[PDB]
């Protein structure tokens, strides 16, 4: 038919999302010490890619 969506299909993708849970991951420092952690990695530990990702299916 002309329309392929319905009100009955509401929340289709969010229901069938496989429901992964977050992992443990101990807390980062907060406040002034988190700015210390930002500064030491992007400056003291030497384009600059802030989030370089490992190679995937694009190459």
């Amino acid at each position: 038919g002309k329309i392929h969506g319905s009100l009955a299909r509401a929340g289709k993708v969010k229901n069938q999302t496989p429901k992964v849970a977050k992992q443990e991951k101990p807390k980062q420092p907060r406040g002034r010490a988190l700015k210390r952690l930002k500064y030491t990695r992007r400056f003291l530990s030497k384009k600059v890619h802030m989030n370089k990702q490992p190679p995937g299916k694009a190459g």
Partner: protein, 212 residues
């Protein structure tokens, strides 16, 4: 039963065609550049042209020793009949077969496609070549494939004389996302002895001589 002379030119061509494929697969990172085999009584010669003669030869000839007996066990030669040699290409910049295998490794080591291809053409054109043309085709940028060509100098393409003057070789680069094919065409400059290039000039160059 003996074969006819028509039946022996066939099996001598399929000999060279199979010998060429084996060494193209083996000696790709040794900078392989061709074979000439000379047959006579008491011995069959095979001369291998390469760019890396310390590597196609082993530490004591170990690599060519294994590479000898691979040809011996396949084609059923006897002991003493088959001897192999390695000669090096004198220029390395006029051999299109060597340069395309290096350009294969410049991409497989995750360098940029255009930086790699101009590194060939700078090296080929400084080595006395009259012209060069590198074509990289495949998924260069993303999901959909492109084609780029990179050019410098002369290039004869329409004649049947381009078999004499233009050296060509095409290989495949097996990326993580797909397959890229690279081509390298080099127009041979000179070398009237036939070291690299024909003796005679180009078919349309007239070059009137000056009087005494």
């Amino acid at each position: 039963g003996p074969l006819s002379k028509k039946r022996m030119i066939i099996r001598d061509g399929v000999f060279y065609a199979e010998l060429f494929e084996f060494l193209k697969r083996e000696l790709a990172e040794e900078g392989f550049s061709g074979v000439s085999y000379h047959v006579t009584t008491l011995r069959t010669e095979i001369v291998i042209k390469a760019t890396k003669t310390r590597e196609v030869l082993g530490v004591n000839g170990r690599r060519i020793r294994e590479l000898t007996a691979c040809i011996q066990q396949r084609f059923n030669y006897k002991e003493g009949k088959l001897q192999l040699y390695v000669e090096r290409v004198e220029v390395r910049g006029l051999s299109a077969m060597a340069q395309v295998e290096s350009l294969r490794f410049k991409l497989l080591s995750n360098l940029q496609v255009r930086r790699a291809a101009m590194g060939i053409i700078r090296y080929v054109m400084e080595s006395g070549a009259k012209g060069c043309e590198v074509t990289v085709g495949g998924k260069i940028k993303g999901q959909r494939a492109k084609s780029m060509t990179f050019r410098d100098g002369y290039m004869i393409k329409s004649g049947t004389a381009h078999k004499s003057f233009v050296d060509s070789a095409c290989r495949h680069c097996y990326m993580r996302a797909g397959c890229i094919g690279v081509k390298v065409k080099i127009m041979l400059p000179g070398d009237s002895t036939g070291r690299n290039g024909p003796s005679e000039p180009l078919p349309d160059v007239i070059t009137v001589i000056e009087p005494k």
